[PDB]
Symmetry: C2
Subunit: 132 residues, 2 copies
């Protein structure tokens, strides 16, 4: 499931970025072999996420948009609570697949909480100082 999610998220991004998604671009972006991509694409095709360049069905597009959103939100989350920027991508890449929608939605409210009043960010930063 996680792997399928990484493929769909990547395909969505490529289509939005280049207008198309090639097996070759998919393979490179995911650091995998084209044989693994072809196999995965056939599975996604079977499950109706896309059609074998390759075009996403409405189902793959809705899921892709959501996966990209999930990624972006999780990066903002760690960024806001002060995680070293260089560590953020790798952590989001691992946890993004293991968070229920309830957790994603709650994390979304947390981000909004800190975004609607900068004093709150200042208050959270102060705690980091005490901890130090």
């Amino acid at each position: 499931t996680p792997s399928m999610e990484d493929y769909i998220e990547q395909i969505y991004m490529l289509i939005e970025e280049k207008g198309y998604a090639r097996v070759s671009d998919i393979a490179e972006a995911l650091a995998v072999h084209p044989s693994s991509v072809t196999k995965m694409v056939q599975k996604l095709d079977k499950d109706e996420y896309l059609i074998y360049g390759l075009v996403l069905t409405s189902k793959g597009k809705k899921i892709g948009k959501r996966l990209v959103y999930r990624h972006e939100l999780l990066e903002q989350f760690l960024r806001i609570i002060g995680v070293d920027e260089e560590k953020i991508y790798n952590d989001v890449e691992g946890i993004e697949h293991h968070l229920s929608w309830n957790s994603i939605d709650r994390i979304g409210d947390l981000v909004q909480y800190f975004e609607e009043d900068d004093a709150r960010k200042k208050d959270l930063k102060s705690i980091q100082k005490k901890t130090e």
Copy 2:
């Protein structure tokens, strides 16, 4: 990640029962005792424990940090409003993919809400503003 789950599980069993048997480990992790004997031999080789099953100081320190990590992540999701029943499965999944930096920052976040209940109330307000 699997090694971390075994170490975390072994530390808890020893802390609760006073010892950790292969059968208790397999039962707690829902796996075959063969898979446990394999992992244990591996943890023994890496010096986290000695093949009853006794943790080395290395395994104890790691074991304790892992249990702390688990507890912390549950408190974090609990505090932001995640349905209690979904918390365990999510933590079990993300615990292995968070850097210590993120863990430490999540630690401050939890401290942030715990030191002033008024902040928890403002967070709840926003959750109700969602529309």
